[PDB]
Structure formats: structure tokens, C-alpha cells
Structure 1
């Protein structure tokens, strides 16, 4: 258990929106991250880990056979066919090389899970696109084809005999795909903090509120923390982790932590509306290292400001590598609106977690 793994392959830059050279989900997202990791000297300190293509059986841990076959068929569709299909989904574009890159995007996470669970590395970060947290069992959504982290969680359970996986989603958007996949599953605890604004922020789902705690035996194992005002800062995220996520995490006792590492809550994002310093992500990453013997894998989700996303990745990477935590430029206190949201989520989860009482 020494070393921080990093997966990046050129294929992550080889699909894009064919009808909009200005699309925000673009190759430059990952290349800019890699450029900054290099100039900060962080890239050379990581252990390079090869990507691999996810297999059908691995995809089928989460996705239906019909959906896998349809997605596989997109590699041969005409551009008109790709346009028609993509219109059947919410906030998606397609490309002939989307499926292949999506398979490597999933597989990049699996490779890091292998290295971490076998103690060859302490932790890791995949610098991957397409993202995953909106993908659902049978549909694309939100620029995602396959649910990278949901597959990785079930893979870790099947292949590495992991009992309990914690998924932490700090992207500014709700990872509804992860929620749906594990809604009835108490072996995978999903926590998402996200802008919500009473449903008026994308993806506009009542299911993104804190009242959605899971179903059946999954009750208590889905935790949504919705922000109902813009402008949240590091102190709000730190308070969410201290009073809610980390108490539950220590009670849950996961053996692996997967992070839906989007950086659209960072100051500078064009649409996230939040004011989180990149340094905050050093702290949030640090906190998660205290769980699961530090067996921690981050995978890139959203974040559309190229520089802010790169800064957030670098801040997280410094913590994975064990560097001293940074000085925080903002206040350490939460705002009233954040305290309101945190209190409500705790109220909704109280019956399930002794640490919240």
C-alpha cells in the first residue's frame, strides 16, 4: 500500500460533439488536467496505470443487456442515426468513438480498484471521460453512457470480495444514476451533495431531495444533501462532511471509497454557482483517507471550467500523494442555508444511523 495511481489515455480525447465545436464536455477537459498535473510536478510523482476496456459481463453488473447492445451498436451508426438516438436522452451527445472511449473510461476505474484492493497502491485517480454518475441501467444521461463508479463498486464486491462500498459524489450535480442503481442495495452507500434549489437546478428531480433515503433494504443507504441557495463555500462542504458524511461513513465501515470527483462546485465554474476553493478538495480528500484504510479511488465526473477543474484535480491529487493540507482561503463556518440543508438531511436519515442521534 504505497503510491498513488493515475490512469490517462489519449482515447479520452478522441470523441467530441460533432455539431458543436464549442461543446462544454470536450477533450480539453482531460488534456488541461494532464497539462497542469505535469507543470505542478504531480504527474511524475504518480504511478502510471494502464487503462483497459470494460467487458460485457462487467457492464452487465449495472446495465441491461438491451442497453449494452444498443450502446455497442452506436460505433457503426451514421451521424443522423446518432443524432436521432441522442435526442431520446437528456443532455447527451453521441459520436462514433463514444462507446470505445466509454469502455476505457469504465475500465480505467477498474484498473485502479485492482491496484488499490491488492495493496499495490494506496489510492488513485482516473482522469477519465466520458463521465459516469448520471448513466442509468438502460439509458444515457447528462453526457454519460456507462456508470463508471457504479460498475466499479459492484466489480470490487464481486472480484475483490468487498462487502461495503461508499460512493461520495461532490460534483455540483446529483448523480441520480448512482442513486437509482443502488436504491435498494444496503451494501453500497451513496452520498451526494449537490445544488438543488428546490428542484429548479438540473437534473430537476424531486428524487434529488433528502427525502429519498433508499427503498426496501436500501433504506438509509442513500443520502442526498441538497443546497437551496447558490454561493456555498468551503466551510459549508467541511460542515457537511463533519456532521453528516463522516459520521455515517465511520458507522458504515466501508472497505473501499469511490469518489465521483466533479469540480463544478469550484469557484470559476460557468454554471455550478458555488464558491468552493480548490483547496477545499484537498481537505475533503484528506477526510476520506481516514475511512477504509485509505483505499480511495477518485474518478473525474463534471466541471466545465478547464482551469478550475484542473485546479480541483491537482488539489485532490496533492492529498492523495500525502502532501500537507493547504491553507484554506475562506472561512471555516457554514452559512445558515447550508446548516438548514444539513439539519434536514440529518432529520431524514436519523432513524438509520446511530451516529446522527
Structure 2
């Protein structure tokens, strides 16, 4: 029986930066983890730099070289290149941080799949779930979890990987990468508002269920109203994700754990209590024998994000689930979105058919 919860963090995550995506995100998460006495209960795991071969599992050779050459670029060359991407800034140390950010999750995948640890959480920036095979996007250079997913498949002989994205933003990067791939199931719960919320993509609706052999293995649930709560996410997990999850039977679960959906986040617009992420985390522990790795994505209110991380951490540590301040009943708008997605993937999953 594997035991212990891995925690990867290195000061290098704070060496690149009004802007919402800042080193303050990660530094104050670690501080709240300590003062809550959660940090000392984790097994501290070293970070490592991702190798080129590992990056090439997801990203193109030309893109990797362009990103590597950003190290020596002038702040005007970084200005030029970054302007050709959607919502992306560049920094001389972005490449190093991005490399250590990916490797941090690979470190945790190794420990969980070799049963040295039960589960893990990398407090890493830059985030990844928006990054694509040949381009930067949404403050992401490399796709942390996509790389980790195929890494586990190659190195640790994993057949099926489930990726859960509860960040308020749609991880179109992950969706694009495994679009035709049935070995990796992608689930994304995100604010959409019929395309008026960033990234403003039609591919972010529940209509996109994948293509080819990957049909049915891509699941988007789009909120079309702000102010969603814990009762909405829990109902969404209970009626959609988890039925599919147990039918899918993954051997590793990766979580794009952004916390911009927590109450008080300026960007998300939702009202999800921090304690809700303790429940969602706990649900996912019943899948893949608890083999569960979380990686930081979004979240822009420093205290709310820190609370979300702590709440997720307690469940990783096997602490009792917390009391929920909000109602257990979901709203009508949430039910509409859940119904629509279920209807869109109905013929692909037996468990959805009632």
C-alpha cells in the first residue's frame, strides 16, 4: 500500500513575471500551506528540468527550439514574439521555469506510479493547460499535464489516463493535443457564456467530443451563467464525470487544478467555496486506485487560490471532508449545461444512458 502525499515546489517558480499571473500566486500558496500545518505533512519532492525528448511527446521540434532561443532574446524580441500569441508574456527565465514546471509533474508521476507515494500536488508556475503543440497560449509555454499524461504512458506503461480540468478556463491546449487520442480522456468544466468568455472558442462547447478514434473521449461542460457554486460542480461530477470515469477505468488521474473558480477570484466570476475542491479531490481518489496527481493552473486571487490548494491538499492527505457552506442543490442553468453535455456524449458512454 502506497502512502504519503508529494509536494513539489522550487524557488525558481518565482523567477519570472499589474499582471495577474505573477510569482505571488505560488509564494503565498506555500505560505498558507505551512501556517495551516499541511506542508510539514507532505513528502517534499525535488523538481527537475524536462528533457527535450519528453517535450517532444507533445510539442513540435521547431517549437521547442524557438522556445529555447527565448532565453537569450532581448526584451524587445520577447515583446515581438509574445505579441503573436493569445494572452502571453515572455521573460528571459520563462523557458527555465516552464521546464522545471513540467518536470515537477513528471517527478510526481514517477513517485505515484512506482507506489513510493499515494498521490501528489505540484505548486508550479507557469501553468500549462492552454499550451499547444506549436504555440504559446494563455500564459502557458509547455503543456504540463499533456506531457505528463503521455510520459506516464511511455515510461510507466500506463494504458489510460484521465485528465480533469476544473480551472474556470477551457484547456483547449489539452483538448487539441488528445483530440484523436482515445487513450487519454479529457474532461473540462469551464465558464463559456456561449463563447463570450475567454478563450472565446466554439471548440469549447460540448459539441466537440473528439474526432476519429477519440470521439467520445473529449468532454466539455460549459457554464453559460456566472456565479456557479459547489452544488453545481458536485452535481456535474456525480452525474457526468465519475460515471464516465469508472467506465473508462483510468490508471492515472491528472488534474488541471486551477482555482480561479473559487469565490472572490476577479477572473473566474464563479462562487465555488474552497471546501468544494476537497470534495472533488476526494471523489477522484476513488478512481485509479487513488493514483492522483494535481498541478497548479489558474487562480488570481492570492488567498482564494491558496485556500483552494489547501482544501485540495487535506483530501490528498486523507483528512475528513469539510462542511459545505453552500447548498447541495444545483441551479437550473447548471442542470441545463449538464443535460446538454450528457446528451452530446450519450451514445459513447453506457453509464450516461438512463
Q: Which residue of 1 aligns with 2:108?
A: 112
Deviations 1:138-193 (A, max 9, x none): 00000000000000000000000000000000000000000000000000000000
Whole-angstrom distance in 1 between the partners of 2:271 and 2:97: 32
Query: Displacement, 1:8?
Result: 0.1
Question: In the TM superposition, what is the alpha-carbon distance from 1:26 to its structure 2 partner?
Answer: 0.3
Structure 2 portions without partners, runs of 5+? none
CA separation in 1, counterparts of 2:4 and 2:66? 38
Shift of 1:291: 0.2
TM-score between the two structures when normalised by the length of structure 2: 0.99
Distance 1:2 1:117 in 2: 12
CA distance in 1, matches of 2:175, 2:45: 29
State the distance in 2 between where 1:163 and 1:35 align. 37
Q: CA deviation at 1:94?
A: 0.3
Q: 1:102-127: per-residue Cα shift (whole Å, max 9, x none)?
A: 00000000000000000000000000
Q: What's the TM-score, normalizing by structure 1?
A: 0.98
Q: Deviations over 1:13-60 (max 9, x none)?
A: 0011xxxxx211000100000000000000000000000000000000
- In the TM superposition, residue 209 of structure 1 has moved relative to its aligned partner by 0.1
Two-structure CA RMSD over aligned residues (Å)? 0.3
Shift of 1:344: 0.2
CA distance in 1, matches of 2:154, 2:40: 32
Deviation for aligned residue 1:271: 1.5
SS of equivalent residue, structure 1 residue 154? helix
What is the CA-CA distance between 1:339 and the residue it aligns to?
Answer: 0.2
Quote the offset at 1:238 in angstroms.
0.3
Secondary structure of 2:34's counterpart equals: helix
Alpha-carbon distance in structure 2 between the residues aligned to 1:149 and 1:43: 23
The match for 1:147 is 143
Q: Alpha-carbon deviation of 1:342?
A: 0.2
Matched ranges for 1:222-241 at <5 A: 222-241=218-237
Q: Flag as ranges the 4+ runs of structure 1 deviating above 6 A.
A: none
Partner in structure 2 of residue 19 of structure 1: none
Q: Distance in 2 between matches of 1:93 and 1:332?
A: 40
- For residues 130 and 270 of structure 1, what CA distance do their matches in structure 2 show? 19
The 1-side partners of 2:80 and 2:187 are apart by 34
Q: Secondary structure at the match of 2:76?
A: helix
| Alpha-carbon distance in structure 1 between the residues aligned to 2:138 and 2:238 | 29
Give the whole-Å Cα distance in 1 for the aligned partners of 2:106 and 2:24: 23
Q: Distance in 2 between matches of 1:77 and 1:138?
A: 19
Cα displacement string for residues 206-261 of structure 1 (whole angstroms, at most 9, x for unaligned residues): 00000000000000000000000001000000000000000000000000000000
In the aligned structure 2, how far is the partner of 1:154 from the partner of 1:39? 36
Quote the offset at 1:101 in angstroms: 0.4
**Structure 1 portions without partners, runs of 5+:** 17-21
User: 2: CA distance between counterparts of 1:148 and 1:272?
Assistant: 21
- Deviation at residue 66 of structure 1 after TM alignment: 0.3
Query: Once the 2 structures are TM-superposed, how far is the Cα of residue 68 of structure 1 from its aligned partner?
Result: 0.2
2-structure distance, mates of 1:15, 1:335: 40
Could you say what secondary structure the match of 2:109 adopts? helix
Q: Distance in 2 between matches of 1:190 and 1:257?
A: 10
Residue 74 of structure 2 is aligned to residue 78 of structure 1: yes
1:177 to 173, 180, 184: 173
Structure 2: distance between partners of 1:46 and 1:252: 30
2:315 is aligned to 319
